[PDB]
From a paper:
Prokaryotic nanocompartments, also known as encapsulins, are a recently discovered proteinaceous organelle-like compartment in prokaryotes that compartmentalize cargo enzymes. Here, we describe a novel encapsulin in the freshwater cyanobacterium Synechococcus elongatus PCC 7942. This nanocompartment is upregulated upon sulfate starvation and encapsulates a cysteine desulfurase enzyme via an N-terminal targeting sequence. The SrpI encapsulin is 24.5 nm in diameter and has a T = 1 icosahedral capsid formed by the self-assembly of 60 SrpI monomeric subunits, similar to previously reported encapsulin structures.
Holo-SrpI (CyD loaded) was generated by denaturation of the purified SrpI shell protein and re-folding the shell protein in the presence of CyD as described in the previous section. Cryo-EM analysis was performed on purified holo-SrpI to resolve the shell structure at 2.2 Å resolution. This represents the first Family 2 encapsulin structure and is the highest resolution structure for an encapsulin to date, allowing for accurate atomic model building. Interestingly, the A-domain of SrpI that forms a pore at the fivefold axis is composed of residues that are positively charged, in contrast to the negatively charged fivefold axis pore of Family 1 encapsulins. Unfortunately, during processing and classification, the holo-SrpI encapsulin proved nearly indistinguishable from the apo-SrpI control. The inability to resolve significant portions of the cargo density may be due to low occupancy, or conformational flexibility of the cargo, which disappears at higher resolutions when many particles are averaged together. However, symmetry expansion and focused classification of the holo-SrpI encapsulin, guided by the 225-NTD-sfGFP-SrpI dataset, revealed additional EM density at the interior surface of the shell that was localized to the three-fold symmetry axis. While the cargo EM density was too weak to accurately build an atomic model of the cysteine desulfurase cargo residues, we were able to determine which shell residues likely interact with cargo density based on their proximity to the putative cargo EM density. Of note, shell residues at the threefold axis neighboring the cargo EM density are highly conserved, which suggests that the interaction between the encapsulin cargo and shell may be conserved. Namely, residues F262, and Y273 are located near the suggested cargo density.
Numbering used by the authors:
A (entry chain A): 8 to 58, 77 to 305
B (entry chain A): 106 to 210
C (entry chain A): 8 to 58, 77 to 105
D (entry chain A): 8 to 53
E (entry chain A): 54 to 58, 77 to 105
Write the structure that this text describes.
């Protein structure tokens, strides 16, 4: 008999990871958008009227929106347990991750801005038979034929499109972006995002042109913020309350503008639950 | 009202954009010059069944077999050709030109 | 017919003044007074009694008064 | 109660874009053609 | 700790958690100003 493992383990330093947040996503849409700074929170998109040359007198003004989160950390927790990991920094990091996920979801789904609600008449396409076939994506590419950037879809919709391509004996090509592989259709990549709504096996697929040089989709943000930690993101210390809770304010200022109406098209009534039966 | 945007420059810029669109339309459609009207006899091909199938584009390539540069088509016709290629189980390849992807046959 | 004024005005930066406060006055009295610093908020004015030379033993002490105002500004307004 | 957004917005410069013209196309044909200069407006193809 | 002082250690050693005592000190701004 000798020294046991459980007793010798009382002398050993455990390697501790930072807390793993499983709802973190790559947030591809934010990385693929072009971001325009708005120095005073107002973006006015002037338009040619009925494209002599006249302009409309009531152009849409985009107001940047504010989302705030208060992060409360007890002073004794950050005082006592900040070795080897800063407790305040981990709380803030995680908080900002959750806020960035919410920001991507708002870029897709917001009622004021938000791609699925700012789609022009004539740019809304419907599937012929529910499932996202190659013909439906060809329709989408008809609607955004001027230099389309990427498709945006739920990963289940990308799988359904892959099944439809397999049934027709068509293997779609792939591209590498940001060290990851994506399906492409007619050279246009299919980008996954779990923020595209999926309810009762029904979802939507978006097609986007991005950039200000083109007349595409642009993201908007506020450029010079006190306590800035990122694009349109700021962190401020709010103070300490009577119960020794230190508070931090995390602010995110963002919006989205579709500069011209042929920069965005949406394929509606996409069914992701259809499976083919292969019989020979 | 020329701060921060030059009004004359914007009017001229927009005017020139519209004129360039008209110029492309004239290069295609003019009655004097214009590709669709200056086509020689024997170079006019007809579709066998309406839809732009791979065989029709092969016919076109027969007519211009000496170093052809590109096809020119309406985007709906490119989509129709893509549908015809999908029905036959043929995925056509793509090339990158000017930072954009194009179907190739 | 050509480009109109209301449409061309959508491209123009407006010159914005700071908010005009009409109750501002020149406040001449403050500019005409002589101002004495009081390092610890207490000013005791000693006096000669019934002007030998004697002083009063209960001189008036002036306590500096405090007026406070809280200015609330939403963070999104100053940010945006 | 404090200063409101609509009132504070009266002090802010709006970012104005140039007018967006939706009929603009990439005009690929013009970019793909080869262009020959004709110094006196007459081109004779022998 | 060494158990029952081969050499073995106890597997449930006492862990001492540092305790926090807080006091809030309120001082009116006019008192410290004046």
């Amino acid at each position: 008999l000798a020294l046991r493992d459980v007793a010798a383990r009382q002398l050993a330093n455990a390697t501790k990871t930072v807390p793993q947040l499983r709802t973190i996503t790559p947030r591809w849409l934010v990385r693929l958008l072009h971001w325009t700074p708005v120095e005073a929170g107002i973006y006015r998109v002037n338009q040619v009227k009925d494209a002599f040359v006249d302009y409309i007198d009531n152009p849409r003004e985009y107001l940047l929106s504010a989302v705030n989160t208060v992060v409360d950390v007890h002073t004794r927790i950050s005082d006592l347990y900040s070795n080897p990991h800063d407790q305040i920094r981990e709380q803030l990091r995680l908080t900002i991750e959750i806020m960035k996920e919410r920001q991507e979801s708002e870029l897709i789904n917001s009622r004021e801005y938000g791609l699925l609600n700012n789609v022009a008449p004539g740019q809304l396409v419907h599937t012929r038979n529910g499932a996202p076939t190659p013909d439906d994506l060809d329709e989408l590419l008809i609607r955004v034929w001027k230099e389309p950037a990427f498709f945006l879809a739920h990963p289940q919709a990308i799988a359904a499109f892959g099944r439809e391509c397999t049934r027709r004996g068509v293997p779609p090509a792939t591209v590498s972006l940001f060290g990851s592989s994506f399906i492409t259709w007619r050279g246009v990549p299919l980008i996954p995002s779990d923020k595209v709504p999926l309810e009762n096996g029904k979802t939507k697929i978006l097609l986007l042109r991005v950039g200000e040089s083109r007349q595409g989709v642009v993201g908007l943000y506020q450029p010079n913020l006190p306590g800035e930690q990122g694009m349109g993101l700021s962190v401020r210390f709010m103070g300490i309350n009577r119960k020794a809770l230190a508070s931090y304010l995390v602010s995110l200022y963002c919006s989205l503008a579709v500069l011209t109406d042929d920069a965005l098209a949406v394929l509606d009534n996409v069914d992701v639950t259809q499976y083919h039966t292969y019989r020979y």
